[PDB]
Symmetry: C3
């Protein structure tokens, strides 16, 4: 008990709320954060909880100097009871569906065992949300067992057809915590 | 009327004729150009029409400083009545079929609505043209609604089986203009 | 006779044995080596046979200055009777299955004709080996005609379910040489 939650941000404008999302999980769980290089255009590091360790692509090397040593993506994958990607960019979505491993975040996921819960809160402009790759990539992740926390539809301009703003932090948090408490530990 | 045509070059040796292709469209349409980083090994910037604005991956940041501001890939996608990729590299072809968004060009395409016409003129060495991923990726783009302007087969050494040199600018131009005039505006 | 063997390393910790693997092939064949940028974190250049030319992504430009000139990925693809990727990373595996061409190694492969033998010795941590993309990507490469030289299962901690350490150099070598001698030249 006291779940180990790995929170990740990818290169979406919604990464500006990532510090806030981290704040939601920290009383309840042990939180560690992973970010992509593009997410750093949108995230303020001083907005995170001070107790949260933020790992970047460069940390993949700071742990590993010689053969034997710990590999960070593998170490974070073993550590976690759950992984939450919020926001999940269109590009990261595609790289996960492509089975790629070119940075800390996709390499943790390419090492993933789908018996451990993995939640994603996609965040993208409505025109990317409605492009046919959104549904194809999310259907693939769904078949693998990922849990989609759907974006806010009718947000800001609506139109009613999907829309793509990231789910609110409070919903992402409650969805993961209610899951947990229904069972895992 | 006076169609807004987005012309793009990817990292093929045929990008050296991209300035010429731009010249073909400028009396008839409002033209804007997008290039990939690899295309700049092959394109001379002084060969473009002087009235054509060339956008690069770096322009994605020059428009966007703070939340609210215009995102260039989305802005170019809204602006365009049609998108023409000529040349279309094997790598860009694969990234489009993979639904990726890692630069201005693939992000415009990952935001695409296939009710708007999208034409591609693939350009690659015969050995890549004949590799089985060429047919698989082009069949996928075809199913989405892209329009292939086939490469020149029997060019330079022929052999008769595909061959891969980019379609001539005059054919790319006439194909897009005859389409337009048959209907869109 | 005296086969032309292209040996490649990708970004796996098993690339530290790449010099040794090269040594296995050099009396029997003409050997040329290709490496990815990530493989250079793990390979010592002084461990290669002195007669082996090592090509990197930067060599793609040192051959090509102007239109007409030789393109290295195409030149290496024509030269080779066989290609051996050992180690084959999870990321390279995914990029090959994605039909991408973003560096010397994937571009040689994206130009490949599967009538020429292509052997791969995957090397990855057990958790990536057991992730479902390993089997999906290897099934795709198999259908194309690639020859898998399976990783060592029961290695170091076993568990019995796959396991991922790269096949020993001696097995990779004997598998390719017995194939050759059964027929090609
Ligand atoms: C100003 C700007 C805003 C961006 N916003 C989004 C977004 O909200 N959602 C999305 O999917 N992509 C967005 N993108 C594009 C991604 O940042 C780009 O695909 C990036 O490669 C994603 O990298 P990552 O997935 O490794 O983090 C935006 C790009 C720019 C320049
Ligand atoms: C000298 C040279 C010539 C190239 N010519 C071609 C070509 O004609 N067609 C193609 O598909 N790729 C070609 N490539 C490989 C692409 O440039 C490489 O895949 C690049 O990543 C494509 O980037 P892009 O698709 O983002 O523009 C060539 C590479 C080199 C070094
Ligand atoms: C310390 C360390 C060890 C690595 N070991 C492996 C490995 O053994 N197998 C693998 O598939 N990936 C491994 N990776 C991840 C790859 O290096 C990373 O995916 C890289 O992008 C692969 O690049 P490449 O395929 O272009 O060479 C490791 C990464 C790090 C930081
Ligand atoms: Ni990439």
């Amino acid at each position: 008990r006291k779940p180990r939650v790995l929170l990740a941000a990818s290169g979406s404008v919604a990464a500006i709320k990532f510090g806030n999302l981290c704040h939601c999980f920290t009383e309840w769980a042990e939180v560690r954060a992973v970010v992509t290089k593009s997410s750093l255009h949108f995230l303020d590091k001083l907005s995170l909880p001070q107790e949260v360790t933020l790992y970047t692509d460069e940390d993949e090397w700071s742990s590993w100097n010689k053969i034997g040593d710990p590999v960070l993506h593998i170490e974070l994958r073993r550590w976690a009871d759950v992984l939450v990607i919020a926001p999940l960019s269109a590009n990261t979505l595609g790289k996960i569906a492509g089975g790629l491993c070119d940075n800390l975040l996709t390499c943790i996921i390419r090492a993933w065992d789908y018996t451990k819960p993995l939640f994603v809160a996609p965040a993208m402009n409505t025109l990317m949300w409605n492009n046919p790759f959104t549904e194809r990539h999310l259907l693939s992740l769904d078949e693998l067992g990922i849990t989609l926390i759907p974006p806010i539809k009718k947000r800001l301009a609506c139109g009613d057809y999907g829309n793509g703003a990231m789910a609110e932090p409070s919903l992402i948090y409650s969805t993961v915590r209610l899951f947990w408490e229904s069972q895992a530990h």
